């Protein structure tokens, strides 16, 4: 079972700014951890599927019939990143390696352009 890793840098300045500012205007202080988990939740919503995906009996039966004539190209997941910064790394087999990447870049975008989104 060959395995491979994927990596991506990160900058956490904006999250620090939001935390500090929130602490000065209300009193709420929270750790970086909740930002990390909340970003992970919004990320694992729309991730492509491996090209070597094999369907199940129910799926084929429903197609052969005509209820779900439009097929699916998305599927949820359950990933957990690895700590680090100046980096975020993940270890996964070869088949999904590509899917695991869509996850890294999605979080890499939200956390740098949408840190405020992870607040209440």
């Amino acid at each position: 079972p060959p395995v491979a890793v994927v990596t991506a840098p990160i900058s956490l300045s904006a999250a620090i700014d939001v935390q500090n500012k929130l602490h000065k205007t209300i009193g709420v202080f929270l750790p970086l951890s909740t930002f990390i988990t909340r970003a992970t939740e919004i990320a694992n919503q729309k991730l492509p599927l491996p090209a070597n995906y094999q369907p199940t009996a129910d799926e084929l039966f429903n197609q052969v019939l005509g209820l779900d004539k439009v097929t699916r190209k998305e599927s949820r997941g359950s990933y957990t990143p690895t700590f680090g910064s100046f980096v975020f790394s993940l270890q996964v087999p070869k088949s999904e390696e590509k899917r695991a990447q869509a996850f890294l870049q999605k979080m890499k975008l939200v956390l740098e352009q949408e840190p405020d989104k992870l607040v209440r």
Partner: protein, 233 residues
Amino acid sequence: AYTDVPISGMRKTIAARLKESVTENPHFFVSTNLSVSKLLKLRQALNSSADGRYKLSVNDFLIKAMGIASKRVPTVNSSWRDGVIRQFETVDVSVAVATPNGLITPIVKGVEGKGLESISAAVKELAKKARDGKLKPEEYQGGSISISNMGMNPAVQSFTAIINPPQAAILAVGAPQKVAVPVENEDGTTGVSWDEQIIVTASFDHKVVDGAVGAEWIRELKKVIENPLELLL
């Protein structure tokens, strides 16, 4: 205080026969539960693409699956004669029709090499003639397996039936019901789903059949029913 009604001539012809079957054939029963959601979806898919030519029902599917299971395990498609065992190669099924003048058993031939439309047309023509009382004797004389269905009454979950004299098996079908089953949700947990099931009982004679043979027969029937596309195969 009471009332008396003379016994009918036809009631002893059946009373003697029923009394002969119990003392001539030891009985042992086997039960199973079948999921029929996919079969209902199939039936709905095949009853809407038509323009009025036909209309199907669960009994036809069960009859065809019975024929396939009989073909895979031929020891049940047999009979016990005076001093020799009879083994057939063609499957004839006996269906039960109830009328005020008593029940009757129309017969369907060549089920193995047939389709659902012909089976439905035959079962309905014979049911009509049985109700109208113009049935020839040759048309209800002998078969290999007998079937009984009571799904018209929702209060019958499972029941037993008596085997006919020359035959060595009978199947009884109950009414559908709903039960909880586990489903592996894509999120990575286990949830509750509501499946619809029927309980099927089979009565077998122990001189021509054994427990393992009946268990295998039930397994082939279940495999053919839960996966309905295999009806083509």
